[PDB]
Amino acid sequence: AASSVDTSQEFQNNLKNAIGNLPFQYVNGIYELNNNQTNLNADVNVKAYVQNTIDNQQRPSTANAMLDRTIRQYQNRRNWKPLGWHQVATNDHYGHAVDKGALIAYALAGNFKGWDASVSNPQNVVTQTAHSNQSNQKINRGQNYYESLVRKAVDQNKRVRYRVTPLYRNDTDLVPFAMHLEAKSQDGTLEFNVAIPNTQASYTMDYATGEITLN
Ligand SMILES: [Cl-]
Ligand SMILES: [Cl-]
């Protein structure tokens, strides 16, 4: 249970195992890693792209992108469930426990030629808590908050190198315990390195199976 409480020692141990001996601190509901510095190189003369990948257990793994206005998607799109999916009606304001969580957001890369930008791209979607997927607030941050930073940067004509990595406790868990987001703009004005805990205050999750126990 403790592994799905974002502030617990157990969670932090898993985080350390997944990212190495990088410094981290809890702030605004997330973990800032390595003083918010990433080694991503945005100063590369390469065409915008997205690359999704999977690991040896067929789980969504490291995703990379170079983002700019050529693949930005402002428009709307014109049964499948991710690994570990077990929906539960919660006792919190979200109403439900989990969302199909994209590694690389539709709005960011939906215009990239040939790419499966759908909600059922099996290399780009995980079981993600509603809280950690949806929260767009600076005070209590979710993945949406960081996606908004990247989106706003691209909308200001910035080139953003971006890397999103689901963090798993071990080789077999179906559901990641956190989402690692890294971003760097060519001009250096945008840079972050964070882990968004795959947690929700009103319940705990067994990351092995995705089974949720409401508080
Ligand atoms: Cl830039
Ligand atoms: Cl929450």
Author numbering: 40 to 117, 125 to 261
Paper text:
One such nuclease, NucA (Gbs0661) from S. agalactiae (henceforth referred to as GBS_NucA), has been shown to degrade NETs and to improve infection persistence in the host. GBS_NucA is thought to be a sequence-nonspecific DNA/RNA nuclease with endonucleolytic and exonucleolytic activity. Although this family of nucleases share a common ββα metal-finger catalytic core and reaction mechanism, their global structures, localization and regulatory mechanisms can vary widely. As a starting point for such development, we have determined high-resolution X-ray crystal structures of GBS_NucA with and without bound magnesium ion and compared them with those of other ββα metal-finger nucleases.
Because wild-type GBS_NucA is difficult to overexpress in E. coli, an inactive form of the enzyme, H148A, was used. A 1.5 Å high-resolution X-ray crystal structure of the GBS_NucA (H148A) apoprotein was obtained in space group P1 in the absence of a divalent metal. Two molecules of GBS_NucA were present in the asymmetric unit. Because the crystallization conditions lacked divalent metal ions, the active site was solvated but otherwise empty. An intricate network of putative hydrogen-bonding interactions links the metal in the active center through Asn179 to the distally located Gln180 and His142, using Asp145 as the intermediary. This network is also present in the apoprotein, where the metal-binding site is unoccupied. Given that this coil is entirely disordered in the P1 crystal form and is incomplete in molecules C and D of the P63 crystal form, we hypothesize that it is highly mobile in the absence of a DNA substrate. Residues Arg116–Asp118 along this loop form a short α-helix (henceforth referred to as α-helix S), although there are no such indications of helical propensity in Arg116–Asp118 in the P1 crystal form. The ββα motif is comprised of β-strands 7 and 8, the latter of which connects directly to α-helix C. The compact active site is outlined by this motif and its deepest recess is formed by the core β-sheet (β-strands 4, 9 and 10).
